[PDB]
Design a protein around this ligand. Structure first.
Ligand SMILES: CCCCCCCCCCCCCCCCCC(=O)OC[C@H](COP(=O)([O-])OCC(O)COP(=O)([O-])OC[C@@H](COC(=O)CCCCCCCCCCCCCCCCC)OC(=O)CCCCCCCCCCCCCCCCC)OC(=O)CCCCCCCCCCCCCCCCC
Ligand SMILES: CCCCCCCCCCC(CCCCCCCCCC)(CO[C@H]1O[C@@H](CO)[C@H](O[C@@H]2O[C@@H](CO)[C@H](O)[C@@H](O)[C@@H]2O)[C@@H](O)[C@@H]1O)CO[C@H]1O[C@@H](CO)[C@H](O[C@@H]2O[C@@H](CO)[C@H](O)[C@@H](O)[C@@H]2O)[C@@H](O)[C@H]1O
Ligand SMILES: CCCCCCCCCCCCCCCCCC(=O)OC[C@H](COP(=O)(O)OCCN)OC(=O)CCCCCCCCCCCCCCCCC
Ligand SMILES: CCCCCCCCCCCCCCCCCC(=O)OC[C@H](COP(=O)(O)OCCN)OC(=O)CCCCCCCCCCCCCCCCC
Ligand SMILES: CCCCCCCCCCCCCCCCCC(=O)OC[C@H](COP(=O)(O)OCCN)OC(=O)CCCCCCCCCCCCCCCCC
Ligand SMILES: CCCCCCCCCCCCCCCCCC(=O)OC[C@H](COP(=O)(O)OCCN)OC(=O)CCCCCCCCCCCCCCCCC
Lengths: 55, 64, 90, 486
């Protein structure tokens, strides 16, 4: 009746931490930039965009 | 510009001394004054070819 | 009296590294099978079967695609459409 | 004086890392990785609102042979980008540290030679996409071939003599006719240039017979039907890096060159002569994707897979329609991801473990390598053209663009979804299933670097497959720059 247990395993293995950290960081970054519709009127990283004028 | 046209021909000279060391199975810096000799020689070739091109351009300018 | 010099001391060439143990038992039949299949072109000859395949796939099949592609060139114009309107151009 | 001082410092740093450290695997990685940090900052300052070429420089001008030049008379070698030219640079630069990584724990004999050759034939195909003359495009279109010859001949697996001769011979033999057609339009126009040649028309009798010299030159490079003799038998004996950089980068170059060279000055010579391109592209899709079925070798199958997708792609370019151009570009950027991952699977991992590439030894890969059989399946099902992978977006739009131009050839060419499923899934279920083989001792699991490569080449397909619009900001001028439907 015993399901014959296997050795103990941690939850937060390194790929859990790496993949979830980068995914949630990119989601938080997207919401952080979408929060500047009324605070500045344009996104934050658009301030780093400096191409030359077409003329 | 004259200066980069000297530095590039001097770099060709450093490449001549380097490759001539490496055919003789020597190390890279074997006779490290020989780099100065080859750099001055090939830079003088750059002087010559630079001045010939200058004078040729001026001859073309005088035809108008 | 013409010998390369006494001043050489030339030695053997190693590739260097670790002798990895054999993870594969090679099968002589499969090896000579594959060596026969990859170098198949050195022993290929023209027979009736070879000529039939070469007649179809090199000559007749590009000519059939050529007939279909150069005849039906600007016929169809299926962009909008209606009922009763011309579906082709010619 | 300043940029000379940077070079005199960097060559000294290179010298001292040569002196103390033995390999320059680390400094080649550092340099090829900094190329990303450079080209992404070039992407930031890229103005997308202009069709214009943004970053222009002439090398080897008369008044200044060793460096930059600002004169009113230009006979050097022009260089620049827009859009089109830039997506393939971004394809390139995020792949060359992966081939430079790809043979890390492998080489063991003259490693300094090998990584120099691999990095050099990557930098030459960067400057391929920077180039702007017909000659400056052409003088780096074959600066690859020497180093490719020597990278196949030394470091090739076995019977690498013949493969090295083929990668010189076939490419050169098709390339000399490109040289002919470049010479003819450099003595007619007196301009080698990628900026002005929209303006210059030619007689249809002239424009007719210089399109031949470029078309049977790209017939060799993207191997179409009287060619592709050489493609599988240069793959099957190549090393690992020179197979990834071949199939991910050298093939998409002629996809770029049919856009850059042919379509905007051969405008009237193509519409007479597209239904030869449809013949040749269809019977590479029908024929070369059908000879895949009977293949004993395992790298040769992924070679002919590359042929079949590049034959789909050039009936999207030659559509003279607006969806096919963008579809062929997204094919070129997604096949260059999914395909070198497959070469890491075939001659990358499995040839490092068992050193023989016959298919007949290889079954039952699941029972001792589960987390390789996953990379077999998701990467195969990415090659077939399951949606959400970026290969289907390209296959779909290119079959649609080739359906506009001639619908019967598009209806026949639509069968490629089937024909690309057949051999790939036949290979996948031979490798994945069955009892673990007799011939095969159990070797290691797929290691940290051969996962780090793979997940990059899988996420970079999935992002394009979920949003193909992440690069519409570049390409929306070049969707228009090549249409001649008046
Ligand atoms: C925003 C979303 C996008 C973010 C993408 C995720 C980035 C995270 C990557 C990362 O953190 O590092 C891991 C990654 C590789 O993993 P690794 O840890 O290094 O591997 C080492 C060992 O393998 C690791 O040790 P191991 O060998 O023991 O691991 C064994 C292996 C097992 O072996 C296997 O068999 C692998 C199986 C196949 C793997 C295929 C990967 C497919 C992933 C699909 C995931 C679906 C996500 C959506 C579902 C959401 C869930 C709700 O495990 C795996 O590697 C598979 C990982 C799956 C675990 C997932 C657990 C967390 C899930 C979190 C998902 C959240 C998403 C958003 C949801 C929340 C927001 C709403 O390394 C990298 O640094 C990759 C580069 C990071 C950027 C990636 C590409 C971005 C840009 C692409 C190029 C630009 C486009 C192209 C331009 C071209 C020119 C136009
Ligand atoms: C038009 C068609 C006209 C019909 C021609 C068929 C043709 C040309 C095909 C070329 C197509 C070009 C492809 C390019 C197409 C471009 C668009 C191929 O003829 C082939 O026919 C095959 C079937 O009959 C044979 O298969 C095999 O057969 C058995 C052994 O013959 C095997 O036992 C069996 O196992 C195989 O089945 C082949 O050996 C034979 O070469 C020529 O047929 C003729 O050629 C001549 C000269 O040689 C032959 O003379 C002989 O050959 C020696 C045998 O060496 C003899 O010793 C010798 O007495 C004499 O010299 C003839 O005999 C005859 O063959
Ligand atoms: C085989 C024969 C073929 C020809 C010989 C091979 C080429 C030799 C290398 C020369 C070409 C690249 C290096 C020099 C040009 C770029 C760097 C530079 O100094 O110019 C800046 C560049 C363009 O100049 P510009 O925008 O007008 O600003 C200058 C204002 N005075 O602004 C930019 O936009 C930067 C563009 C840089 C990207 C260049 C392509 C990246 C690949 C670099 C490969 C370099 C290989 C060097 C190998 C080193 C080995 C020791
Ligand atoms: C395989 C064998 C065949 C392979 C062939 C590959 C050939 C590659 C040759 C490359 C030489 C030409 C390099 C172009 C110069 C790149 C550059 O711009 O370097 C900077 C400097 C030019 O400075 P300047 O033009 O005055 O403008 C500065 C404004 N910011 O330029 C310089 O000061 C000169 C620095 C380069 C010196 C090269 C010396 C020869 C190298 C050997
Ligand atoms: C950017 C990268 C390009 C320049 C980088 C050069 C710096 C690094 C040089 C290097 O380390 O490799 C040179 C090679 C190795 O020698 P070394 O490293 O000193 O000792 C062996 C240690 N395993 O020394 C050699 O053994 C070179 C021997 C060459 C043998 C024939 C291979 C020729 C390849 C060059 C192509 C020939 C023609 C090129 C035509 C133009 C095409 C661009
Ligand atoms: C689109 C969505 C994102 C793409 C899919 C994302 C999946 C990410 C994680 C995949 C993990 C899959 C896995 O780990 O399967 C392992 C499985 C092991 O089998 P096991 O029971 O452990 O016994 C083996 C005997 N030694 O190994 C196997 O037996 C092989 C079966 C693989 C099953 C993978 C399931 C995902 C397939 C989706 C196809 C997507 C195509 C694109």
């Amino acid at each position: 009746h015993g399901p014959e247990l296997t050795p103990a395993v941690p939850f937060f293995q390194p790929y859990v931490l790496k993949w979830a950290g980068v995914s949630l960081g990119l989601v938080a970054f997207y919401q952080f930039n979408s929060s500047y519709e009324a605070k500045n009127g344009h996104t934050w990283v658009e301030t780093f965009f400096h191409p030359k004028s077409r003329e | 510009a004259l200066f980069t046209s000297l530095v590039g021909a001097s770099g060709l000279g450093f490449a001549t001394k380097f490759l001539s060391n490496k055919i003789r199975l020597k190390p890279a810096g074997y006779y490290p004054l020989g780099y100065v000799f080859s750099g001055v020689a090939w830079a003088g070739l750059g002087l010559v070819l630079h001045n010939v091109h200058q004078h040729s351009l001026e001859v073309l300018e005088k035809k108008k | 009296e013409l010998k390369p010099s006494s001043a050489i001391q030339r030695g053997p060439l190693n590739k260097g590294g670790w002798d990895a143990p054999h993870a594969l038992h090679n099968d002589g039949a499969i090896d000579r099978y594959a060596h026969w299949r990859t170098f198949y072109q050195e022993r290929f000859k023209y027979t009736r079967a070879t000529g039939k395949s070469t007649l179809i796939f090199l000559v007749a099949f590009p000519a059939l695609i050529g007939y279909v592609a150069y005849q039906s060139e600007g016929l169809f114009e299926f962009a909008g459409k209606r009922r009763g309107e011309s579906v082709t151009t010619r | 004086m300043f940029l000379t001082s940077i070079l005199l410092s960097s060559l000294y740093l290179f010298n001292r890392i040569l002196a103390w450290q033995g390999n320059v695997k680390h400094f080649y990685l550092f340099a090829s990785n900094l190329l990303l940090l450079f080209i992404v900052v070039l992407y930031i300052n890229f103005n997308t609102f202009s069709n214009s070429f943004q970053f222009n420089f002439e090398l080897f001008n008369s008044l200044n042979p060793f460096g930059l030049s600002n004169s009113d008379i230009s006979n050097g070698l022009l260089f620049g980008i827009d859009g089109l030219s830039l997506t393939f640079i971004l394809l390139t630069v995020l792949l060359i540290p992966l081939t430079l990584l790809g043979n890390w724990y492998n080489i063991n004999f003259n490693s300094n030679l090998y990584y120099t050759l691999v990095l050099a034939i990557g930098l030459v195909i960067l400057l391929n996409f920077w180039a702007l003359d017909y000659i400056s495009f052409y003088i780096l279109f074959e600066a690859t071939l020497p180093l490719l010859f020597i990278l196949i001949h030394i470091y090739g697996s076995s019977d690498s003599e013949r493969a090295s001769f083929y990668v010189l011979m076939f490419t050169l033999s098709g390339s000399l006719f490109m040289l002919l057609s470049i010479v003819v339009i450099s003595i007619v126009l007196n301009t080698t240039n990628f900026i002005n040649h929209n303006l210059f028309v030619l007689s249809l009798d002239l424009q007719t017979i210089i399109w031949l010299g470029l078309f049977i030159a790209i017939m060799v490079k993207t191997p179409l039907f009287p060619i592709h003799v050489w493609l599988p038998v240069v793959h099957s004996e190549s090393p690992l890096a020179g197979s990834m950089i071949l199939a991910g980068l050298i093939l998409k170059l002629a996809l770029y060159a049919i856009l850059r060279l042919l379509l905007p000055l051969l405008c009237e010579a193509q519409i007479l002569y597209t239904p030869m391109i449809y013949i040749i592209s269809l019977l590479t899709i029908i024929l070369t994707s059908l000879a895949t079925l009977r293949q004993i070798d395992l790298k040769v199958i992924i070679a002919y897979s590359s042929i079949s997708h590049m034959g789909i792609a050039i009936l999207g370019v030659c559509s003279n329609t607006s969806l096919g151009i963008y579809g062929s570009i997204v094919l070129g950027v997604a096949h260059g991801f999914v395909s070198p991952a497959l070469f890491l699977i075939v001659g990358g991992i499995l040839y490092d473990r068992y050193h023989i590439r016959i298919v007949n030894y290889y079954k039952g890969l699941t029972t001792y390598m589960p987390q390789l059989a996953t990379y077999i399946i998701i990467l195969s099902f990415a090659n077939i053209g399951t949606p959400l992978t970026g290969n289907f977006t390209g296959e779909f739009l290119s079959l649609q663009g080739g359906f506009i131009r001639n619908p019967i050839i598009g209806g026949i060419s639509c069968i490629s979804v089937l024909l690309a499923a057949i051999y790939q899934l036949k290979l996948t279920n031979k490798l994945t299933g069955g009892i673990s083989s007799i011939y095969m001792h159990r070797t290691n699991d797929v290691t940290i670097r051969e996962k780090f490569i793979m997940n990059i080449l899988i996420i970079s397909t999935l992002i394009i497959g979920i949003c193909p619009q992440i690069m519409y900001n570049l390409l929306y001028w070049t969707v228009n720059n090549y249409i001649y439907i008046i």
